[PDB]
Design an enzyme around this catalytic site. Structure first.
Site, PDB file in Angstrom:
ATOM      1  CG  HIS B  26      35.969  28.109  19.032  1.00  0.00           C
ATOM      2  ND1 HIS B  26      35.344  28.173  19.507  1.00  0.00           N
ATOM      3  CD2 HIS B  26      37.382  28.870  19.882  1.00  0.00           C
ATOM      4  CE1 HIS B  26      35.135  28.070  20.102  1.00  0.00           C
ATOM      5  NE2 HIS B  26      36.592  28.008  21.118  1.00  0.00           N
ATOM      6  CD  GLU B  69      33.359  30.059  20.377  1.00  0.00           C
ATOM      7  OE1 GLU B  69      32.619  29.545  19.516  1.00  0.00           O
ATOM      8  OE2 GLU B  69      33.111  30.640  21.481  1.00  0.00           O
ATOM      9  CD  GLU B 145      27.748  32.206  21.371  1.00  0.00           C
ATOM     10  OE1 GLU B 145      28.474  32.420  20.258  1.00  0.00           O
ATOM     11  OE2 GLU B 145      27.854  31.547  22.046  1.00  0.00           O
TER      12      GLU B 145
HETATM   13  C1  LIG Z   1      33.128  23.561  23.891  1.00  0.00           C
HETATM   14  C2  LIG Z   1      32.796  25.016  25.055  1.00  0.00           C
HETATM   15  C3  LIG Z   1      33.509  25.093  25.484  1.00  0.00           C
HETATM   16  S1  LIG Z   1      33.638  26.036  23.835  1.00  0.00           S
HETATM   17  C4  LIG Z   1      31.633  26.272  23.634  1.00  0.00           C
HETATM   18  O1  LIG Z   1      30.827  25.549  23.095  1.00  0.00           O
HETATM   19  C5  LIG Z   1      29.078  25.749  22.912  1.00  0.00           C
HETATM   20  C6  LIG Z   1      28.703  24.485  22.357  1.00  0.00           C
HETATM   21  O2  LIG Z   1      27.089  24.637  22.147  1.00  0.00           O
HETATM   22  C7  LIG Z   1      28.457  27.222  21.742  1.00  0.00           C
HETATM   23  O3  LIG Z   1      29.896  26.624  20.319  1.00  0.00           O
HETATM   24  C8  LIG Z   1      29.897  27.810  22.679  1.00  0.00           C
HETATM   25  O4  LIG Z   1      29.745  29.445  21.490  1.00  0.00           O
HETATM   26  C9  LIG Z   1      32.192  28.079  22.729  1.00  0.00           C
HETATM   27  O5  LIG Z   1      31.820  29.353  23.203  1.00  0.00           O
END
Ligand SMILES: CC(C)S[C@@H]1O[C@H](CO)[C@H](O)[C@H](O)[C@H]1O
Ligand SMILES: CC(C)S[C@@H]1O[C@H](CO)[C@H](O)[C@H](O)[C@H]1O
Ligand code: NA
Ligand code: NA
Ligand code: NA
Ligand code: NA
Lengths: 211, 211
Positions: B26, B69, B145
């Site tokens: 990510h 991600e 998700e």
């Molecule tokens: C920082 C967000 C724009 S990305 C977002 O953050 C979330 C936190 O619970 C999860 O990790 C999601 O899977 C992720 O896409």
């Protein structure tokens, strides 16, 4: 098929036209009783073939239609194929029998709602957004009739256009319809007034549904 | 991949499982900088192949995931095919790079909304109802998700389920997520309390987003 001058005007002023065969057997029970009967294929074929022979050179005509409200019969499949064979330059559509039969290149339902399904047996009218994504479906969807403008109507019209603009495959539709079919009559004072079903002693009749 | 006992329990108690490779990049810029780099294909391949070799006999596992991600890179396509070849009994999915790339058998977006489109550049999150019918699309859609349950949340959860039930190809999704990742700390009195990001001197940190 319309008066010949109509296509000339649409060619010159610019309007897309759906040319439709003079075939409607709505009052039959079931609706396809005649259209699924080979004995009537000859009569039906001429209503389709002679229309194509007359209007195939008009640029305004972009889609051929096999008729209206005559259910879905084997005769429709035969004529659908005849047109596809003789004139591959234009898609063929027909709403009878569920609006998404083997006799149409376009899902062309009449009065299917935007979000609400109407699960009628055999011939359901799914929400148009839902219809597009049914398993295996890939055709564009253009309502042959929608937004019944009878009297004080067209409530919810904006909901259709919001969907049309959001969904690529929802490519619009044809409002029902352009002009009230009222006729002129005259009272004692010779004053003309607008008349509808039954006003000519005609019975049975369906009164104001012609408007 | 989870602790081995988890699959045993899912097999016996009955829960459909999506086994996911330990691959998430990510933080890269762009997100696929490593996954599109052949130099990293070896490291990535082991995280996918060794997962399959370990859990391929568990009936609870019904879908393989290439990770999370890490954008969409050529390495994903290579590994997608590797799985398809060695184990055709399970569909392969992956959300990176737009949720509908060539490395996934299932449209698996994260937080795509029900009716509202989110036209992000390159990786838009279309309304799920709209996504299913995009020109040429035929795959099923299951959110990997959705409904981010952070704190007082899950507002609008009912909207998803109404859509899931109405649309055949909208086959559900996985809520994010099961349990708060809060950790226990003790005060001067020895009394325990729930701690989150930053409560351990850890910095930089993302505070309460772990819950
Ligand atoms: C920082 C967000 C724009 S990305 C977002 O953050 C979330 C936190 O619970 C999860 O990790 C999601 O899977 C992720 O896409
Ligand atoms: C259920 C009946 C009203 S059929 C209905 O009647 C309408 C009257 O304007 C139009 O003719 C529609 O095309 C027709 O399907
Ligand atoms: Na559209
Ligand atoms: Na009418
Ligand atoms: Na569904
Ligand atoms: Na989080």
């Amino acid at each position: 098929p319309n008066h010949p001058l109509w296509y000339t005007l649409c060619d010159r002023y610019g309007l897309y036209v759906v040319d439709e065969a003079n075939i409607e057997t709505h009052g039959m029970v079931p609706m396809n009783r005649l259209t699924d009967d080979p004995r009537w294929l000859p009569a039906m074929s001429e209503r389709v073939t002679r229309m194509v022979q007359r209007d195939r050179n008009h640029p305004s005509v972009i889609i051929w239609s096999l008729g209206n409200e005559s259910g879905h019969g084997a005769n429709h499949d035969a004529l659908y194929r005849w047109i596809k064979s003789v004139d591959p330059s234009r898609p063929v559509q027909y709403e009878g029998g569920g609006a998404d039969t083997t006799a149409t290149d376009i899902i062309c339902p009449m009065y299917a709602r935007v979000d609400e399904d109407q699960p009628f047996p055999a011939v359901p009218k799914w929400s148009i957004k839902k219809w597009l994504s049914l398993p295996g479906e890939t055709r564009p969807l253009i309502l042959c009739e929608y937004a019944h403008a009878m009297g004080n109507s067209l409530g919810g019209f904006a909901k259709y256009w919001q969907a049309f603009r959001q969904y690529p495959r929802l490519q619009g539709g044809f409002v029902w319809d352009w002009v009230d079919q009222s006729l002129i009559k005259y009272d004692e004072n010779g004053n003309p007034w607008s008349a509808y079903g039954g006003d000519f002693g005609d019975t049975p009749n369906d009164a104001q549904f012609c408007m």
